[PDB]
Amino acid sequence: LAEALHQAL
Numbered sequence: 643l644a645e646a647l648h649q650a651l
């Protein structure tokens with residue numbers, strides 16, 4: 643999740 647969100651943002 644941490645990096646999924648990092649990509650998204």
Ligand SMILES: [Co+2]
Pocket residue numbers: 645648649
């Ligand atoms: Co990252």
